[PDB]
């Protein structure tokens, strides 16, 4: 295989082998010539980027490079070319979503094992300094790779660091706060909620709130107490109980990640 592109330091090679195509992302097979391991060479549509924002991207790419956990996709490097190139760990066995689109009843042994690996990944992110909130957890952003089909969370593009103050680098809080503005102070529990929906999808082989017609309808049913229609189809009571504790409307009522890892369901080792 001949290289059609190279990183400036000469470490990463690009091959003209397309392994994935997104709406704003094309992924090519690549090679890390320092380890002779292949990698994913991701080409992203570069937005109009202000110079401060380009500097924040480089700052955040250094943080991402320092992350190392068995259940998080490894991030190797980023740079600009003429688009933005991201080099990450290559996921050889596709996303969790494609497994659900091929089969209809996941076995509970796999549901327990794969969900436990997801929780270990989230626990890692949520215990960094500062904590990292993924914000974009879905079965398309969870990958399977390697001989034993290990589970890893990827695609941290929508992630954010957890902060305390209302505005960034400007202390203070508004007095005539609109209700939606008061609710904008969410935390890592939004990842618990998304995990509950992923677990619901894996347990039912159905997209949550499939019965709804558009994105707008999706909300009002949660708040009025109406869970997804597929929720009432979970046949394992312990599984249904875990999902319910994750998608509770009030965040303070939900599981934390550590509470989920201490659950009897995930404390089973078989």
Ligand X SMILES: Nc1ncnc2c1ncn2[C@@H]1O[C@H](COP(=O)(O)OP(=O)(O)NP(=O)(O)O)[C@@H](O)[C@H]1O
Ligand Y SMILES: COc1cccc(-c2cc(C(=O)N(C)[C@@H]3CCN(Cc4ccc(Cl)cc4)C3)c3ccccc3n2)c1
**Contact between 32 and Mn ion per CB under 5 A:** no
Q: Which residues are annotated as a binding site for chloride?
A: 75, 86, 156, 158
How many residues of this chain interact with ligand Y, rule: CB under 6 A?
19
Q: How far is CA 87 from CA 5, 41, 64, in A?
A: 12, 5, 11
What is the C-alpha separation between 202 and 161, in angstroms, rounded?
28
Rounded to the nearest whole angstrom, what is the least distance from the CB of residue 142 to ligand Y in the complex? Answer: 12
Q: What is the footprint of ligand Y within residues 96-125 (CB under 6 A)?
A: none
DSSP string, 123-192: HHHHTSSSPEE-----GGGEEEETTTTEEEE---TT-EE--SSSBTTB----SS--HHHHHT---THHHH
**Contact between 155 and Mn ion per CB under 5 A:** yes
For 176-192, b/e burial (b = at least 16 CB within 10 A) is eeeeeeeeeeeebbbbb
In angstroms and rounded to an integer, the radius of gyration of the C-alpha atoms of the chain is: 20
DSSP E strands in 33-127: the ranges are 37-44, 75-80, 84-89
**Contact between 89 and Mn ion per CB under 5 A:** no
Pattern 70-109, ligand X, x by CB under 6 A: ---x--------------x-xx--xx--------------
Chain breaks in the chain (C to N over 2.5 A) after: 82
**Contact between 204 and ligand Y per CB under 6 A:** no
**Contact between 215 and ligand X per CB under 6 A:** no
Q: Which does 40 bind (CB under 5 to 8 A by kind): ligand X, ligand Y, Mn ion, none?
A: ligand X
Pattern 123-142, ligand Y, x by CB under 6 A: ---------x----------
> 155 an active-site residue?
yes
Interacting residues toward ligand X by CB under 6 A? 19-20, 22-23, 25, 27, 40, 73, 88, 90-91, 94-95, 140-141, 154-155
Interacting residues toward ligand Y by CB under 6 A? 44, 57, 60-61, 63-64, 72-73, 75, 78, 86, 88, 132, 154-157, 159, 161
């Amino acid at each position: 295989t001949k290289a059609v592109g190279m990183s400036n330091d000469g470490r990463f090679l690009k091959f003209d082998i397309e392994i994935g195509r997104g709406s704003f992302k094309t992924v090519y097979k690549g090679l890390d010539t320092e380890t002779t391991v292949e990698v994913a060479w991701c080409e992203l549509q570069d937005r109009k980027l202000t110079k401060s924002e380009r500097q924040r991207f480089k700052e955040e790419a250094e943080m991402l490079k320092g992350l190392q956990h068995p259940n998080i996709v490894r991030f190797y490097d980023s740079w600009e070319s003429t688009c933005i190139v991201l080099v990450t760990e290559l996921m050889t066995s596709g996303t969790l979503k494609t497994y659900l689109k091929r089969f209809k009843v996941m076995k509970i042994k796999v549901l327990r094992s794969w969900c436990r690996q997801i929780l270990k990944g989230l626990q890692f992110l949520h215990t960094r300094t500062p904590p990292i909130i993924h914000r974009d957890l879905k079965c398309d952003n969870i990958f399977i790779t390697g001989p034993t089909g290990s589970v890893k969370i990827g695609d941290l593009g929508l992630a954010t660091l957890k902060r305390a103050d209302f505005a960034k680098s400007v202390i203070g809080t508004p007095e005539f706060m609109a209700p939606e503005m008061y609710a904008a102070a969410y935390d890592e529990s939004v990842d618990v909620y998304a995990f509950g929906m992923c677990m619901l999808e894996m347990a039912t082989s159905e997209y949550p709130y499939s019965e709804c017609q558009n994105a707008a309808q999706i909300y009002r049913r949660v708040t009025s107490g109406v869970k997804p229609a597929s929720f009432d189809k979970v046949a394992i009571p312990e599984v249904k109980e875990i999902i319910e504790g994750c998608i509770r409307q009030n965040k303070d009522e939900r599981y934390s990640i550590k509470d989920l890892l201490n659950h009897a369901f995930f404390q089973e080792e078989t």
